[PDB]
Design an enzyme around this catalytic site. Structure first.
Site, PDB file in Angstrom:
ATOM      1  NE  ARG A 129      -9.472   9.609 -42.521  1.00  0.00           N
ATOM      2  CZ  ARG A 129     -10.036   8.891 -41.571  1.00  0.00           C
ATOM      3  NH1 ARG A 129     -10.066   7.567 -41.640  1.00  0.00           N
ATOM      4  NH2 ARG A 129     -10.585   9.496 -40.515  1.00  0.00           N
TER       5      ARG A 129
ATOM      6  NE  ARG B  49      -3.707  11.602 -38.190  1.00  0.00           N
ATOM      7  CZ  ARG B  49      -3.783  11.318 -36.906  1.00  0.00           C
ATOM      8  NH1 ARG B  49      -4.959  11.245 -36.304  1.00  0.00           N
ATOM      9  NH2 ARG B  49      -2.666  11.107 -36.231  1.00  0.00           N
TER      10      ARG B  49
ATOM     11  CG  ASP C   6       1.947  15.460 -32.484  1.00  0.00           C
ATOM     12  OD1 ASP C   6       1.200  15.060 -31.578  1.00  0.00           O
ATOM     13  OD2 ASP C   6       2.307  14.784 -33.460  1.00  0.00           O
TER      14      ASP C   6
ATOM     15  CG  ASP D 104       0.855  11.737 -37.640  1.00  0.00           C
ATOM     16  OD1 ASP D 104      -0.349  11.421 -37.545  1.00  0.00           O
ATOM     17  OD2 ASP D 104       1.782  11.011 -38.042  1.00  0.00           O
TER      18      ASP D 104
HETATM   19  N1  LIG Z   1       0.251  18.279 -27.659  1.00  0.00           N
HETATM   20  C1  LIG Z   1      -0.641  17.558 -28.323  1.00  0.00           C
HETATM   21  N2  LIG Z   1      -0.908  17.799 -29.618  1.00  0.00           N
HETATM   22  C2  LIG Z   1      -1.791  17.047 -30.257  1.00  0.00           C
HETATM   23  N3  LIG Z   1      -2.494  16.001 -29.797  1.00  0.00           N
HETATM   24  C3  LIG Z   1      -2.136  15.707 -28.508  1.00  0.00           C
HETATM   25  C4  LIG Z   1      -1.277  16.440 -27.727  1.00  0.00           C
HETATM   26  N4  LIG Z   1      -1.150  15.890 -26.470  1.00  0.00           N
HETATM   27  C5  LIG Z   1      -1.961  14.885 -26.509  1.00  0.00           C
HETATM   28  N5  LIG Z   1      -2.612  14.697 -27.706  1.00  0.00           N
HETATM   29  C6  LIG Z   1      -3.595  13.634 -28.034  1.00  0.00           C
HETATM   30  O1  LIG Z   1      -3.002  12.641 -28.887  1.00  0.00           O
HETATM   31  C7  LIG Z   1      -4.059  11.950 -29.609  1.00  0.00           C
HETATM   32  C8  LIG Z   1      -3.571  11.629 -30.984  1.00  0.00           C
HETATM   33  O2  LIG Z   1      -2.311  10.951 -30.920  1.00  0.00           O
HETATM   34  P1  LIG Z   1      -1.671  10.159 -32.092  1.00  0.00           P
HETATM   35  O3  LIG Z   1      -2.753   9.523 -32.854  1.00  0.00           O
HETATM   36  O4  LIG Z   1      -0.586   9.297 -31.552  1.00  0.00           O
HETATM   37  O5  LIG Z   1      -1.079  11.361 -32.939  1.00  0.00           O
HETATM   38  P2  LIG Z   1       0.125  12.346 -32.827  1.00  0.00           P
HETATM   39  O6  LIG Z   1       1.406  11.672 -32.624  1.00  0.00           O
HETATM   40  O7  LIG Z   1       0.002  13.262 -34.001  1.00  0.00           O
HETATM   41  O8  LIG Z   1      -0.324  13.170 -31.479  1.00  0.00           O
HETATM   42  C9  LIG Z   1      -5.244  12.860 -29.594  1.00  0.00           C
HETATM   43  O9  LIG Z   1      -6.431  12.195 -29.164  1.00  0.00           O
HETATM   44  C10 LIG Z   1      -4.837  14.071 -28.823  1.00  0.00           C
HETATM   45  O10 LIG Z   1      -5.832  14.496 -27.899  1.00  0.00           O
HETATM   46 MG   LIG Z   2      -1.628  14.439 -34.008  1.00  0.00          MG
END
Ligand SMILES: Nc1ncnc2c1ncn2[C@@H]1O[C@H](COP(=O)(O)OP(=O)(O)O)[C@@H](O)[C@H]1O
Ligand SMILES: [Mg+2]
Length: 158
Positions: free
Chosen positions: A82, A92, A97, A95
């Site tokens: 943030r 936020r 992943d 992101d």
């Molecule tokens: N491979 C992963 N990496 C990160 N978060 C994940 C993954 N798989 C599932 N999640 C879940 O996705 C949620 C967050 O998703 P979102 O807010 O859409 O963000 P993003 O697209 O960055 O994952 C979290 O609660 C997390 O537990």
């Molecule tokens: Mg994420």
């Protein structure tokens, strides 16, 4: 274990956030950055008009367990994700992943590895392809093949 992490930011000027995030990723314990993709720009995803996204891919060597790594990436999202905007903190905009974790397949309430939708996202696949062109997924698919099959447009560098 080699973990591949996607970074996204839709701040209007995201470079300072993204660099803060990269530094934070390098400071995760039991881990170090192997390589970072270029920064790529991708449009919006709605009628009106939302900001461009900056996307990038990072190769991280790590001896943490997958869910331990997620704790760290979610921590970085909370600490760096943030930006203060005048009199208040913005929502936020960062992101993180986990796209791949070694050759492992993970399906828990918290983690889906490989990332649940990355095969539909040129903005995830192209930065990964830059830093891992010979990558094979745990199911045997090759990254190259996915890009060949879908013919996703190439993205411009930031
Ligand atoms: N491979 C992963 N990496 C990160 N978060 C994940 C993954 N798989 C599932 N999640 C879940 O996705 C949620 C967050 O998703 P979102 O807010 O859409 O963000 P993003 O697209 O960055 O994952 C979290 O609660 C997390 O537990
Ligand atoms: Mg994420």
């Amino acid at each position: 274990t080699v973990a591949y992490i996607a970074i996204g930011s839709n701040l209007a000027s995201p470079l300072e956030q993204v660099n803060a995030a990269l530094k934070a990723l390098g400071d995760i314990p039991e881990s170090h950055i192997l390589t970072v993709s270029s920064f790529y720009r991708t449009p919006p995803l709605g009628p009106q008009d939302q900001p461009d996204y900056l996307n990038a891919a990072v190769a991280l060597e790590t001896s943490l367990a997958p869910e331990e790594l997620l704790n760290h990436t979610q921590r970085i999202e909370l600490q760096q994700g943030r930006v203060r905007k005048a009199e208040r903190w913005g929502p936020r905009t960062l992101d993180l992943d986990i796209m791949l974790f070694g050759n492992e397949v993970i399906n828990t309430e918290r983690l889906t590895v490989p990332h649940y939708d990355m095969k539909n996202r040129g903005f995830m696949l192209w930065p990964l392809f830059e830093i891992a062109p010979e990558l094979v997924f745990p199911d045997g698919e090759m990254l190259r093949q996915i890009l060949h099959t879908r013919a996703f447009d190439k993205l411009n560098k930031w």
